[model samples]
Target: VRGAIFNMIGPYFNGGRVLDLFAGSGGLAIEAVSRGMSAAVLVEKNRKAQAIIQDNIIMTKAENRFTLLKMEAERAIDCLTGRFDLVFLDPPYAKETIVATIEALAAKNLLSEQVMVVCETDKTVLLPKEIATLGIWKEKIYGISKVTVYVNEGHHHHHH
Candidate 1:
């Protein structure tokens, strides 16, 4: 299920750090790293869930590429002070708060200029087409979860 979501979003990028807000099982974060992300910060508050995330990182033998934060989404954002090129928001369906969280990150200026946020939520979750500093790049529904991709609106033009 998770793999399909990322597959459609084309998570295979060249380089960047990925922030997975609800790092349940850590599959999405792991996949992002495997694809090409330089590093990942996977945040989960539950003790048991943190253990599982640690175990998965160990199994990869690339623990250096991952940092597991055992904290709630709110604190994790406050504690994390730096720019992340990509972020994944998959909060529980009933407890959906992606919009607020996204606004928080923007307020803190934690996202890179070209940042991309991928949100997974209940099919009924209707996110705005634009939110401060970012605009909807893509959106779709797959079975029970809806996926929306938001990219920075003020992206810099890079010539390589």
Candidate 2:
């Protein structure tokens, strides 16, 4: 599933940071750095999952490129303070939190000017044509999951 989503929108890029909001196993964030992103922040509330994420980061010998946040997504987003070129919003399928988190990330001025946000949800979920200034860049379905990509139009650019 992770590989499928990557093929749709990643495995390529220069130097930029990535965020995996609901990082269940940190695979997405790890892959982002492995592919070329400068660094990645992985947010997960579950302790067991964090352990797995920690082990994975250690195994990669790129622990410095990853930040493991042991907190809820909402709090994690607030705690994170930096620019992110890409973000993965793969929250629990039963509930949706992409809009609110996207808003939070924007409100905190955490996204880059042309940040790319990838949202993964159940196939039945219907996303809007645009989220604020982030228009729906692309969408694809894979079995029970649907991957939606959004890129900020830079109407609210955060100048560093």
Candidate 3:
């Protein structure tokens, strides 16, 4: 998880909207809010994990900026309409749906063009067909797990 820590310890996400798709217990989502993001949407499919997100929100009393969605990642993407500046996709290591999710986001236009996709997985292996314009910020690997940050071609630097 050190890779995740390092990626999260940056001056990004201020006043931006964040989507934590595979949010189990709201760790990443809550942390996003802690870092000054205006809003954080945490989506978890598991029943217990879903409840944990709600509980965490209640405990923190940050309901205004933190929201928990009890649904699958696809449903979360469907329910989301506004563009998010930062999107967290921490799918299970066993699940190989990151590329699919990325494709769906691209197709549905849910992600801001300049958005950042922070993905943690076995090898930072989410690949899109055409990322010619988009650039890779970097990738960090810790044992089998890898954390990657991608710069959306449409991303613009906003002053904090």
Best by TM-score: 1
Tens digits of per-residue lDDT for model 2 on 16-133?
8898889899898898888778899888888789889999999888799998888888887778787889999999975577787788888889888879999999899998878766
lDDT by residue for model 1 (70-104), tens = 88899988989889998999998766788899999
Give the residue spans of candidate 3 off by over 4 A: 2-12, 124-133, 154-160
Q: Residue 130 in candidate 3 has what lDDT?
A: 45
TM-score for each candidate, following the candidate numbering: 0.92, 0.91, 0.83
lDDT of 3 by residue, 29-132 (tens): 77777767888888887987877778778776777788777787887777788898788878887765766787788777877766878778876465553443
Pairs in steric clash, model 3: 113-154, 114-154, 114-155
- Candidate structures ordered by lDDT, highest first: 1, 2, 3
Clashing pairs in 1: none
Cα RMSD (Å) per model? 2.4, 4.0, 2.9
| Candidate 2 or 1, higher TM-score | 1
The local distance difference test score of each candidate is: 0.86, 0.84, 0.73
**Candidate 2 lDDT (Cα, whole model)?**
0.84
